[PDB]
Amino acid sequence: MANAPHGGVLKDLLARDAPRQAELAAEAESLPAVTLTERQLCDLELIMNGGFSPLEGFMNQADYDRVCEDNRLADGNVFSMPITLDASQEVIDEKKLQAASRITLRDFRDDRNLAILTIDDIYRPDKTKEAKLVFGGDPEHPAIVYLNNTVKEFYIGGKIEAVNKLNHYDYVALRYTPAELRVHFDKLGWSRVVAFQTRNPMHRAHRELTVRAARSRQANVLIHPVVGLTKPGDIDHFTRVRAYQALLPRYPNGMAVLGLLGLAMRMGGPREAIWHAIIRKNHGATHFIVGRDHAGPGSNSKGEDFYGPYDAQHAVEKYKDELGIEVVEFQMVTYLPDTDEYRPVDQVPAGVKTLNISGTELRRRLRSGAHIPEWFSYPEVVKILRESNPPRATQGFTIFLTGYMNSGKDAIARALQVTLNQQGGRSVSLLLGDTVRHELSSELGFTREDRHTNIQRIAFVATELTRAGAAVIAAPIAPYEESRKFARDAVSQAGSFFLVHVATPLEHCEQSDKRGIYAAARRGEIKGFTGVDDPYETPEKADLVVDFSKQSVRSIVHEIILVLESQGFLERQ
Amino acid sequence: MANAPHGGVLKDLLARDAPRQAELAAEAESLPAVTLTERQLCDLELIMNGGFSPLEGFMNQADYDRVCEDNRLADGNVFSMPITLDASQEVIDEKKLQAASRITLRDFRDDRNLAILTIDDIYRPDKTKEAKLVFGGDPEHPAIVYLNNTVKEFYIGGKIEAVNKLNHYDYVALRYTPAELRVHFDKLGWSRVVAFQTRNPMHRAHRELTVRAARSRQANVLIHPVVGLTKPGDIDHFTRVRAYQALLPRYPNGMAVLGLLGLAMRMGGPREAIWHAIIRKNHGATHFIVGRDHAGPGSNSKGEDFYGPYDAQHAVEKYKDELGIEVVEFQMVTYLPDTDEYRPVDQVPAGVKTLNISGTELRRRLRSGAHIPEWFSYPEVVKILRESNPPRATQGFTIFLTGYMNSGKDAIARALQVTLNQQGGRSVSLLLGDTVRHELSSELGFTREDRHTNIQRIAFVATELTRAGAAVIAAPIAPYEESRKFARDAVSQAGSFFLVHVATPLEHCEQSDKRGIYAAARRGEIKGFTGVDDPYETPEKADLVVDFSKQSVRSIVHEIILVLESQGFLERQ
Amino acid sequence: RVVAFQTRNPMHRAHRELTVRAARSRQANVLIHPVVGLTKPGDIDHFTRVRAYQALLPRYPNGMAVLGLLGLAMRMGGPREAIWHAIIRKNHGATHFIVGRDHAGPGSNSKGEDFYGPYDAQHAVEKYKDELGIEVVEFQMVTYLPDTDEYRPVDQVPAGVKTLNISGTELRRRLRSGAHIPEWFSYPEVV
Ligand SMILES: Nc1ncnc2c1ncn2[C@@H]1O[C@H](COP(=O)(O)OS(=O)(=O)O)[C@@H](OP(=O)(O)O)[C@H]1O
Ligand SMILES: Nc1ncnc2c1ncn2[C@@H]1O[C@H](COP(=O)(O)OS(=O)(=O)O)[C@@H](OP(=O)(O)O)[C@H]1O
């Protein structure tokens, strides 16, 4: 086999309870139901699949206490991370929860019944104690700011009975239970396996690092990246995974397996590192790389590191032998251009080439689109990591016109459309004031509130189109700063926004009115008409100001085109 | 200059009335304005800029009749096609229109004042005589059916005065007036110039007709394709011009010029031809190519060809000498594979290679994406002509789910999103029932009418996104066939639509309801709730039927993915 | 729904277009299930064959197929083997099974007699099909249309397109000689 489960027996509860599936499923229907948070879900998944072996439920007091203070569960097995389910008095009463109560753990994403937990105790934990003992104490620590702003007042210990495994629709082939991974290592004659934990990109150095370990420890590699619960439309998450997959064939043929790991990290440094060692051991890895600042939060508001570069490694080594897993401490190497190789911080003769790119500099570049050294990260991988920060020539954008009724914005807008359909870089969506009123706001009025709603409605549609990479041209009146500000923020989430104030003077608008709407509004036939009986909050930081009285349309369209051209949006075909 | 104008003087009314622009301008601010149609604006453009010399206003009765019988204008000059403005008695009176009346001719696209027509008469045309001798007759003919259905009872003759150029925002570099083209031919020393008339794609044999025709008449080439007024989002149009532009570099360097002619064709065969010949002569061409069925409407109901394959070429030679311009009747050649050349319907030895693709076959192919012979049409040109019939792997599409409240469609929808965001071919827009209700229909109700409006609202947004190439997933209840049919038609205009009926049985939906909405609706706390007090018109031709009681979501999402995959939409990366 | 394909041969473009069409029409995925007997440690021919199959795998729509080896000792018992085959794939979880002309066929005796007719396999698996609980997918192998750059049934071809179809005896012949092979016939990396 690979490495034995932590505690000697894999707590594969889904396998254990499979035979009763349908009955637990039936009863899971009636029981009082607690709907889990994202953290309790990620935990439940590893509890159920034996990832937290020997653990087999959410921690009760005898486990939790000896874990918070001794890094051990009651039975004596090493375990450095509190795994608990929390509730408030309201719900504990509200649902009659108490020792012996059987409850249903529900998935907040799709409402599935995942498990049935038979209660042990319902204690009120000392969070001040937990934060200091488990995460260091700093009020700024992520897991602490969480333990005090989300975790409820009480913990509910209790063994778990698995009914259904969580449903994930992204990358099922890359999701491996500890059993699947163990079977896999076994089919291929695998014995020693070095697991690599990460929550980041993965470049050349990472590739050279894992390979060297594998080769020196005469072993195979498990690339085990961490993911939390997937956000249906979180493209960043898909980009990340594709990055990893892209990197897979740069590894010696047959040496590695890529596997996603559903873990809700605390960023509890040393303590998480030990936890991690356990989880990989359960997953069948025999070796675990531990890095500098492993699972590290970084530094507080006033530059204090929450942990030192080496505490992780010092922790996992202290327990290493007991746990039965080998640690592989990495001494990351650099690049030697003249050489075309990589070597330890020492295997480099004085004066070779200190070629090493910065992470802050890499992000910086990925953002700017500034070429990245192929010696630093493979092409196909970088090609994918960039997609989450696309080139302006690809981004959709919204041109949001605003100004009095009949200020010429409609004509300007139509001409901008023909102009942009000629440059042909994207599809163009036109949302004229009236079209919007007819299609999406036919039953709204003109009160401050109603107009605001109408604009939020244009922003929403514009924001979806901007996200699809379209060029959206909107020409509502948008009399209020509050509205326009809203539209700008809504759309910015998906691409760029430009406010063009068609500042044509009112008098000009009225005089040229050939529909008598200003006339009717003047004589009360229309209530609170903008400019007449309702205000027009003149824009203050418009991206472009124009006057249909002073400039022709092609000239105006062209000023708009110039702004877009100057920001890289139009890099033509 | 090239060939002298028609009649002898270029009717550059715009140039003329230019020193009086502002004056005639302000005078049009008050005169009784009339908005012209597209056929009228296109006739107005060539009148105000001389394209129609000697003609200089819409033909009053004198001009109009001698043309219908003698093919001549009043003053004796040849002119085979009527240029008349029209109106109905309601408007003749409404504004008080009689000879000596000064009307303002308005542009519908932007309400710009273009010309001031000072009447000469207001007669009522024998739309029967005209349509018979002028357009050949047959009750089918496109111009006839326009004449009878669209042309008003009476025509308004009167010379014209130019007040504004007429704003086009596309391809200004390709838009030439007869003056502009004359100046260009003059700067280049161009004497003899051969013009080409087309309303079609222009492939390779064309580049062979033109070059061969010009090199033998020792001349240069004016590629003069036609265009009516531009519908701001008539992508096909930009595609066409782009095709023409890509073809330009396939010409012996400097041999040809590309010019767009804003002419409204009447598809009036032999007579339109002769009209064309004058238009080009006014534009400075010394020669004109006249083809088989030039300006032909093809066939009629029973299959009768309105004109003979040579009624056009032979019609122009009758007046050829008088007009001044010379005719270059083309004898289109074929392709010789073995040879790698093209030659007349006779210059081909018995048994070479009758390689000639069909037009009906080419459209057919362009549609299907079936490769097209480079000997037939250049690559870069065909690459563009296809963009108006994109590959399914590029088209956006809408997956429109429908079924009872809580039928599982929401969960299906979310998983379809994750699934589609993993395949990453397009951006994905999720329009869940509630999101839609909150963002676009927050103030609609649930009456037959209201729900219908809500769906039309989803269709609109979905149709814009489908057009931008997005994957749209909508999960409203959509209880009515009328609604769903509407959405299907709205979206089909921009891409594909799939109706997925989440046919989960009501009982199942109620039993599983964990929000008590079915409960409340049962006891009257909610009026006309679908399934309870309001009907659910079960779909009949759903693209896919699913049951959330019988199938898991991944299995359901996968059936949906299979349909998409099978229709070429997912051709992955 | 999963359509299994049984073979003991190479696998080219036509085979690729065939399996795909079935999958698409029956709204299903594909199981490429080639047959292998016990491996001869140094039988390079066997490694070549499998690599051929693997090479062909990415020419299949992303996500549509799975390649799986099947340890079967065939008898070349035509009709009867075909039924047997249907059973084995059904056990393997396939819901559909393609049955070809001369499925698991020995060919013809010393004096030109076919041991079975082109269609007996299909007639056998259909006779039992419903009882067994597996759907048969009879293939109507298509040809190639050069002018078109497509493939179509022995009928979907207008009179005079291009009867472009390479022979198996001619393919072996070529593979041997090293004489170029039409990319429209078999993918490059596979050949
Ligand atoms: N009280 C009042 N105030 C302002 N505008 C009014 C009002 N009542 C009607 N209209 C007519 O509706 C169009 C203005 O719509 P908008 O969508 O621009 O309004 S807003 O931006 O939400 O404030 C525009 O008409 P269209 O030309 O049909 O768009 C206005 O003339
Ligand atoms: N009379 C009536 N009929 C149907 N549904 C009703 C009704 N009244 C309210 N609701 C709640 O609104 C959601 C259903 O809205 P839909 O937009 O899907 O319905 S429709 O397609 O417009 O007919 C859905 O709620 P959410 O799922 O919370 O959005 C319904 O429970």
- CA–CA distance, B246 with B252 (Å, rounded to integer): 14
Count of residues in chain B: 573
Q: What are phi and psi of B51, to 5 degrees?
A: -55, -25
- CA–CA distance, A443 with B335 (Å, rounded to integer): 63
Whether residue B460 and residue A467 make contact (CB cut-off 8 A), yes or no, is: no
Q: B326 - beta bridge partners?
A: B287
Whether residue B415 and residue A167 make contact (CB cut-off 8 A), yes or no, is: yes
Q: 3-class DSSP state for residue A35? A: strand
- CA–CA distance, B511 with B525 (Å, rounded to integer): 18
- CA–CA distance, B302 with A381 (Å, rounded to integer): 63
CA angle, residues B130, B133, B139, in degrees to nearest 5: 75
CA angle, residues B191, B193, B195, in degrees to nearest 5: 165
Whole-number Å distance, alpha carbon B483 to ligand 2 midpoint, is: 15
A456 annotated ligand-binding residue: no
Active site residues of A: 198-200
Other Cβ atoms less than 10 A from the Cβ of C88: the count is 17
From residue A435, alpha-carbon distances to A218, B110, B276 in Å are 68, 17, 40
Does residue A434 have its Cβ closer than 6 Å to ligand 1? yes
Does residue A451 have its Cβ closer than 6 Å to ligand 1? yes
Whether residue A233 and residue B557 make contact (CB cut-off 8 A), yes or no, is: no
The helix (run of H) or strand (run of E) holding residue A521 is helix A517-522
Superfamily of domain A2-189: Sulfate adenylyltransferase (3.10.400.10)
Does residue B491 have its Cβ closer than 6 Å to ligand 2? no
Class of residue A3 by CB neighbours under 10 A (exposed 0-12, middle 13-18, buried 19+): buried
- CA–CA distance, C79 with C59 (Å, rounded to integer): 31
CATH 3.10.400.10 residue spans of chain A? 2-189
Whether residue C64 and residue B570 make contact (CB cut-off 8 A), yes or no, is: no
From residue C38, alpha-carbon distances to B175, B530, C5, C33, C184 in Å are 76, 63, 20, 16, 33
Looking at the CA of B433, name the nearest ligand.
2
Q: What is the CA radius of gyration of chain A?
A: 30
B185-206 exposure pattern, b = at least 16 Cβ within 10 A, e = fewer: beeeebebbbbbbeeebbbbbb
Quote the DSSP letter at residue A543.
S
Residue nearest to ligand 1 atom 12, measured at CA: A434
Ligand 2 atom at shortest distance from the alpha carbon of B475: 18
Residue nearest to ligand 1 atom 24, measured at CA: A405
Position C62, amino acid = N
Whether residue B371 and residue C149 make contact (CB cut-off 8 A), yes or no, is: yes
Best A106, A113, A164, A169 member to test B by mutation, with max B CBs in 10 Å, is A169
Q: Tell me if A60 sits within 8 A of A86, measured CB to CB.
A: no
Q: 3-class DSSP state for residue B319? A: helix
- CA–CA distance, B355 with B333 (Å, rounded to integer): 10
Class of residue A423 by CB neighbours under 10 A (exposed 0-12, middle 13-18, buried 19+): middle
Enter the resolution in angstroms.
2.6
Q: A267 - beta bridge partners?
A: none
Determine whether C49 is an active site residue.
no
From residue B123, alpha-carbon distances to B137, B354, B409 in Å are 22, 55, 66
Considering only CB atoms, B440 lies closest to which of A230, A457, A467, namely A457
Q: Tell me if A444 sits within 8 A of A454, measured CB to CB.
A: yes
The helix (run of H) or strand (run of E) holding residue B506 is helix B506-512
Considering only CB atoms, A235 lies closest to which of B171, B421, B554, namely B421
- CA–CA distance, A206 with A194 (Å, rounded to integer): 13
Q: 3-class DSSP state for residue A86? A: strand
- CA–CA distance, B133 with B114 (Å, rounded to integer): 32
Other Cβ atoms less than 10 A from the Cβ of B167: the count is 16
Q: A155 - beta bridge partners?
A: A86, A123
From residue B318, alpha-carbon distances to B273, B276, B315, B321, B326 in Å are 12, 15, 6, 8, 11
Find, among C46, B418, B412, B85, the residue nearest to A232 by Cα: B418
Active site residues of B: 198-200
Determine whether C9 is an active site residue.
yes
- CA–CA distance, A385 with A390 (Å, rounded to integer): 10
CATH-assigned architecture of domain C1-191 = 3-Layer(aba) Sandwich (3.40)
- CA–CA distance, A54 with A31 (Å, rounded to integer): 27
Q: Which of A409, A436, A437, A532 to mutate to test the pocket of ligand 1 (most atoms within 8 A of CB)?
A: A437
Whole-number Å distance, alpha carbon B529 to ligand 2 midpoint, is: 8
* HSE (side-chain half, CA atoms, 13 Å) at C4: 24
- CA–CA distance, A271 with A269 (Å, rounded to integer): 5
Method: X-ray
Position A474, amino acid = A
Quote the DSSP letter at residue A248.
G
Whether residue B468 and residue A426 make contact (CB cut-off 8 A), yes or no, is: yes
In this structure, which CATH number among 1.10.3720.10, 1.10.20.10, 3.40.50.620, 3.40.190.10 belongs to the domain A190-389? 3.40.50.620
Sequence-ordered list of residues with C-beta below 8 angstroms from that of C170, at least 6 positions apart, any chain: none
Structure tokens at C108: 């013809």
Q: Which of B406, B446, B448 to mutate to test the pocket of ligand 2 (most atoms within 8 A of CB)?
A: B446
- CA–CA distance, B337 with C72 (Å, rounded to integer): 52
Best A164, A175, A421, A463 member to test B by mutation, with max B CBs in 10 Å, is A421
Looking at the CA of A432, name the nearest ligand.
1
Q: Tell me if A36 sits within 8 A of A105, measured CB to CB.
A: yes
Q: Tell me if B264 sits within 8 A of B43, measured CB to CB.
A: yes
From residue A160, alpha-carbon distances to A15, A58, A180, A386, A485 in Å are 13, 7, 21, 43, 50
A451 annotated ligand-binding residue: yes
Q: Which residues of C participate in the annotated binding site for ATP?
A: 6-9, 100-103, 142
From residue B551, alpha-carbon distances to A84, A149, B410, B555, C106 in Å are 34, 40, 15, 6, 43
- CA–CA distance, B492 with B498 (Å, rounded to integer): 10
Sequence-ordered list of residues with C-beta below 8 angstroms from that of C67, at least 6 positions apart, any chain: C32, C34, C53, C54, C57
Q: Tell me if A174 sits within 8 A of A241, measured CB to CB.
A: yes
- CA–CA distance, B135 with B138 (Å, rounded to integer): 8
Sign of the C-alpha dihedral computed for residues B170, B171, B172 and B176 taken in this order: negative
Quote the DSSP letter at residue C95.
S
CA angle, residues A25, A26, A31, in degrees to nearest 5: 95
CATH 3.40.50.300 residue spans of chain A? 390-572
A434 annotated ligand-binding residue: yes
Find, among A272, A282, A269, A264, the residue nearest to A55 by Cα: A282
Class of residue B454 by CB neighbours under 10 A (exposed 0-12, middle 13-18, buried 19+): buried
- CA–CA distance, B516 with B522 (Å, rounded to integer): 10
DSSP for B201-229 reads: ---HHHHHHHHHHHHHTT-EEEE--B---
DSSP for B470-494 reads: -EEEEE-----HHHHHHHHHHHHTT
Whether residue A469 and residue B467 make contact (CB cut-off 8 A), yes or no, is: no
- CA–CA distance, C183 with C92 (Å, rounded to integer): 33
Find, among A265, A300, A37, A266, the residue nearest to A151 by Cα: A37
Give me the torsion for CA of B540, B541, B547, B552, rounded to 10°.
-170
The helix (run of H) or strand (run of E) holding residue A423 is helix A409-423
- CA–CA distance, A72 with A326 (Å, rounded to integer): 19
Q: Which residue of B has its CA nearest to C148?
A: B370
Q: What are phi and psi of A376, to 5 degrees?
A: -95, -45
Position A427, amino acid = S
Q: What is the largest CA-CA distance in chain B?
A: 91
Find, among A406, A372, A570, A402, the residue nearest to A500 by Cα: A402
- CA–CA distance, A344 with B281 (Å, rounded to integer): 81
Place of tokens 């989440």: B502
Q: Tell me if A366 sits within 8 A of A389, measured CB to CB.
A: yes
Helices and strands per DSSP (H, E), number in chain B: 21, 17
From residue B373, alpha-carbon distances to B377, B414, B446, B486 in Å are 7, 45, 57, 40
Give the chains touching A; criterion: ≥3 Cβ pairs < 8 Å: B
Q: Tell me if A334 sits within 8 A of A342, measured CB to CB.
A: yes
Place of tokens 């601010």: B29
Place of tokens 């999101």: B435
Other Cβ atoms less than 10 A from the Cβ of B360: the count is 8
CATH-assigned architecture of domain B390-573 = 3-Layer(aba) Sandwich (3.40)
Position A472, amino acid = V
Find, among B164, B186, B169, the residue nearest to B20 by Cα: B164
- Beta pairing class for A261-262 and A220-227: parallel
Considering only CB atoms, B566 lies closest to which of C27, C147, C148, namely C27
Sign of the C-alpha dihedral computed for residues B535, B541, B544 and B545 taken in this order: positive
Other Cβ atoms less than 10 A from the Cβ of B527: the count is 12
- CA–CA distance, A464 with B461 (Å, rounded to integer): 9
- List chain B residues with CB under 8 Å of C148: 370-371
From residue A260, alpha-carbon distances to A208, A232, A241 in Å are 20, 17, 9
Q: What is the CA radius of gyration of chain B?
A: 30
Find, among B341, B338, B313, the residue nearest to B327 by Cα: B313
Determine whether C62 is an active site residue.
no
Position B277, amino acid = A
Give me the torsion for CA of C81, C82, C85, C86, rounded to 10°.
-140
Q: Which of B401, B405, B440, B455 to mutate to test the pocket of ligand 2 (most atoms within 8 A of CB)?
A: B405
Q: 3-class DSSP state for residue B426? A: coil
Does residue A271 have its Cβ closer than 6 Å to ligand 1? no
Q: A299 - beta bridge partners?
A: A305
- CA–CA distance, B108 with B121 (Å, rounded to integer): 24
Ligand 1 atom at shortest distance from the alpha carbon of A475: 18
Q: Tell me if B331 sits within 8 A of B291, measured CB to CB.
A: no
Q: Tell me if B154 sits within 8 A of B124, measured CB to CB.
A: yes
- CA–CA distance, A86 with A156 (Å, rounded to integer): 6
Whole-number Å distance, alpha carbon A531 to ligand 1 midpoint, is: 11
B553: left (phi over 0), alpha (psi -120 to 50) or beta: alpha
Q: Tell me if A239 sits within 8 A of A171, measured CB to CB.
A: no
Q: Tell me if A454 sits within 8 A of A530, measured CB to CB.
A: no
Place of tokens 């240069």: B220
Q: Tell me if A98 sits within 8 A of A123, measured CB to CB.
A: no
Considering only CB atoms, A169 lies closest to which of B242, B426, B554, namely B554
Considering only CB atoms, B457 lies closest to which of A428, A439, A553, namely A439
- CA–CA distance, B431 with B414 (Å, rounded to integer): 10
Looking at the CA of A479, name the nearest ligand.
1
Find, among B242, B88, B90, B270, the residue nearest to B174 by Cα: B242
Place of tokens 């001794």: A70
DSSP for C96-157 reads: EEEE-TTTT---B-TTS-BSS-TTHHHHHHHHHHHHHT-EEEE----EEETTTTEEE-SSSS
Q: 3-class DSSP state for residue B57? A: strand
Superfamily of domain A390-572: P-loop containing nucleotide triphosphate hydrolases (3.40.50.300)
- CA–CA distance, B59 with B104 (Å, rounded to integer): 17
Q: Tell me if B126 sits within 8 A of B144, measured CB to CB.
A: no
Sign of the C-alpha dihedral computed for residues C160, C166, C170 and C175 taken in this order: positive
The helix (run of H) or strand (run of E) holding residue C32 is strand C29-36
Structure tokens at B453: 């409006």
Structure tokens at C22: 């079935």
> Angle, to 10 degrees, between the axis of helix A127-135 and the axis of helix A269-282?
80
Report the Cα A553 to chain-centroid distance in Å. Answer: 44
CATH 3.40.50.620 residue spans of chain B? 190-389
Sequence-ordered list of residues with C-beta below 8 angstroms from that of A226, at least 6 positions apart, any chain: A197, A198, A199, A260, A261, A262, A263, A265
Q: Tell me if A416 sits within 8 A of A560, measured CB to CB.
A: yes
- Beta pairing class for B102-107 and B158-162: unpaired
- CA–CA distance, A53 with A5 (Å, rounded to integer): 7
Q: A208 - beta bridge partners?
A: none
Class of residue A572 by CB neighbours under 10 A (exposed 0-12, middle 13-18, buried 19+): exposed
Does residue A406 have its Cβ closer than 6 Å to ligand 1? no
Contacts by A183-190 with C-beta closer than 8 Å and gap 24+? A184/A257, A185/A2, A185/A220, A185/A284, A186/A1, A186/A2, A188/A220, A190/A2, A190/A220
Find, among B62, B384, B49, the residue nearest to B202 by Cα: B384
Structure tokens at A351: 């004066």
Sequence-ordered list of residues with C-beta below 8 angstroms from that of A241, at least 6 positions apart, any chain: A170, A171, A174, A225, A227, A260, B422
Q: Tell me if B334 sits within 8 A of B355, measured CB to CB.
A: yes
Q: A256 - beta bridge partners?
A: A221
- Beta pairing class for B496-502 and C70-71: unpaired
The helix (run of H) or strand (run of E) holding residue B328 is strand B326-329
The residue ranges of DSSP E strands in B41-93, in sequence order, are 57-58, 86-87
- CA–CA distance, B446 with B464 (Å, rounded to integer): 25
Q: A33 - beta bridge partners?
A: A104
Class of residue B289 by CB neighbours under 10 A (exposed 0-12, middle 13-18, buried 19+): buried
Sheet with B102-107, strands from edge to edge, namely: B33-36, B102-107, B112-119, B158-162, B57-58
- CA–CA distance, C172 with B26 (Å, rounded to integer): 87
